[PDB]
Ligand code: HEM
């Protein structure tokens with residue numbers, strides 16, 4: 001028997017403090033039913049990991065949001081990677097893997113790190129800053145659009161579009177419908193920048209379009225793959241870096257450990273991704289009747305995976321609610337897991353690592369010195385405003 005809960009995981013009260021409700025979801029049973037939206041829910045690490053690693057049964061091509069693409073028209077053309085199952089997912093996935101490859105990271109790392117150091121220096125000259133707008137947003141905005149090969153004009157559309165995308169995975173609540181109402185200009189800009197002539201030589205987009213002659217993708221698939229990078233490539237890392245700075249501000253002992261050994265930067269970022277889980281949730285749809293956690297789930301059912309809860313499951317993690325920069329983080333699902341596991345994770349980890357290295361070498365203290373404001377999104381967890389004072393080393 002599967003327990004029925006009335007918790008709305010997409011309510012503003014849930015977003016404000018999801019951890020008690022995530023414990024209630026976990027402790028109710030391995031599989032729950034959320035009556036509010038008529039979906040199954042999995043909040044423990046084990047069931048989330050199992051669902052993510054069974055794309056045949058728990059598919060993505062009927063949408064990874066609440067909407068079932070077999071029942072409703074998608075709000076935009078389906079992503080050729082995120083909203084695709086194998087085998088159609090495989091070759092676009094490969095192209096994106098080679099575009100955001102170790103070699104590409106080697107080409108861009110010196111500039112990403114230089115830009116992170118310069119940003120921390122500028123903020124240190126300012127002293128009191130907003131760690132969201134002036135850091136978590138400003139740094140990825142300073143490196144990622146250029147690495148894409150985007151022109152300067154119209155970049156102010158990138159964060160709104162992203163927010164829209166992440167709101168659109170949610171249920172048809174006020175956040176989602178409001179997002180879609182305001183979507184037209186951001187959609188117009190983003191779809192336009194996806195065309196080959198609009199992507200500067202040597203950038204991620206130009207490389208995607210250059211990969212259109214190997215038999216893995218065709219030229220008509222390249223704009224949508226550039227669209228994938230313009231959908232996920234900025235906002236997720238904004239909330240990851242914001243998560244990390246929020247953690248270092250809340251856990252000064254961990255900031256002191258990070259200063260003492262800056263080579264912990266990468267893991268300090270990885271732990272942040274586990275601790276806050278900026279991408280909180282994703283859906284799957286059952287392609288057949290399946291037994292999961294002793295519960296029978298019929299065909300065509302939406303299954304809501306709580307990635308943040310899975311990353312705080314005490315069945316899997318010791319002291320899951322502590323931020324520990326030397327934690328063995330391998331296995332967390334903040335980047336997903338399986339065939340869809342974040343293809344841009346090397347970029348995200350590069351940005352987070354070099355930013356946290358900059359803070360580790362340059363900043364003595366991070367003190368919250370203003371009202372903290374949360375940003376509400378159906379899929380992303382993160383702050384709207386994080387006022388901090390940076391004491392230089
Ligand atoms: C802290 C930063 C990030 C987090 C937490 C994050 C999270 C995730 C998660 C959980 C998934 C799995 C989706 C699923 O299983 O349905 C995913 C997939 C994906 N992410 Fe990331 N992401 C981040 C950064 C990035 C970046 C920087 C890029 C591109 C430059 C990117 C592009 C993508 C794409 C294209 C997919 C689809 C992968 C696939 O379906 O095979 N993401 N991301």
Ligand SMILES: C=Cc1ccc(C(=O)O)cc1
Pocket residue numbers: 079080081082083165227228229231232236279
């Ligand atoms: C992880 C978020 C995400 C959003 C959009 C896409 C896409 O548009 O393919 C991929 C990942």
Ligand SMILES: [Cl-]
Pocket residue numbers: 076077187190191
């Ligand atoms: Cl679009």
